[PDB]
Design a protein around this ligand. Structure first.
Ligand SMILES: Cc1nc(-c2nc3cc(Cl)ccc3[nH]2)c(C)c(-c2ccccc2)c1[C@H](OC(C)(C)C)C(=O)O
Ligand SMILES: Cc1nc(-c2nc3cc(Cl)ccc3[nH]2)c(C)c(-c2ccccc2)c1[C@H](OC(C)(C)C)C(=O)O
Lengths: 141, 141
């Protein structure tokens, strides 16, 4: 599968919102607790993500997530396209959160601990952290 | 230079705080506008950074930044060490911000645009985004 493809979705936990980006070819996650599910937050998160990785196209399970001109502007500026055709790893991330949730006071901290655990964990075999970097390097030179 | 080494500092701009992490071997930046320069923010940012990259040791230009047990806990949990001996790229990032600052309403958005521009820009020669991934892949298998 193509190396510039990400998937972006929100989950709710403790009445708060978690934005979850999955790098599809690799399983690597970035995530962030946002105070509300707005186009503002999604636009911002997209700019952050695009500064960090080569992001060509973004899929979602909720297309209306992407309809605001606020979001369309971010994609425009960073040069991102939306999907043309078409786990959950939200599941196990949500498993890992509940697991570490005692280890921290705020949800946001548990989230980051869970992203840490998820991206490092060897599946086998490489880790999602190792696979992303390999995929993206393999695809450069 | 060693691939797990990052440098973390804050700058102030428009009475707000920008936390800037530089991957030293590569020049790659992650950055974030934080509302105040606390141990809470730095601890959190460190957890985020460590979930994303292999982070062994972190340097700073302001050692007191790292003295809180709040920060020491984050490093403890993620397995990070502080420095044992020892651009600014804060300079040009601050150049890029002023450059794009019209292109956006908030500082935080200008920051991310500037991180995007900085990480992509080919120096020559690869980009900081390409060098980080190469360095980290080169160092794996
Ligand atoms: C609020 C908070 N306060 C403290 C904390 N720092 C302390 C310093 C002292 Cl002296 C006493 C008690 C203290 N408790 C700590 C040590 C953490 C922390 C927990 C796990 C890993 C890293 C840091 C958090 C943490 O929140 C962040 C800072 C990461 C945003 C959380 O959600 O649990
Ligand atoms: C506050 C804000 N509002 C709008 C905006 N969205 C609109 C939608 C409509 Cl219908 C009309 C005017 C609009 N203005 C936009 C389009 C942006 C934006 C600017 C550059 C790139 C991506 C998005 C921002 C932006 O803030 C973030 C959303 C990125 C946090 C900023 O700081 O300039």
């Amino acid at each position: 599968c193509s190396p510039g493809i990400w998937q972006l979705d929100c989950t709710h936990l403790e009445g708060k919102v978690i934005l979850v980006a999955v790098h599809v070819a690799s399983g690597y996650i970035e995530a962030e607790v946002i105070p509300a599910e707005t186009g503002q937050e999604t636009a911002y998160f997209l700019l952050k993500l695009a500064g960090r990785w080569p992001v060509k196209t973004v899929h979602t399970d909720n297309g209306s997530n992407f309809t605001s001109t606020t979001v369309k502007t971010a994609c425009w500026w960073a040069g991102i396209k939306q999907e043309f055709g078409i786990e959950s790893m939200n599941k196990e991330l949500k498993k890992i959160i509940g697991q570490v949730r005692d280890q921290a006071e705020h949800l946001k901290t548990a989230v980051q601990m869970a992203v840490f655990i998820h991206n490092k964990k060897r599946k086998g075999g490489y880790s999602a952290g190792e696979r992303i970097v390999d995929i993206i390097a393999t695809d450069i030179q």
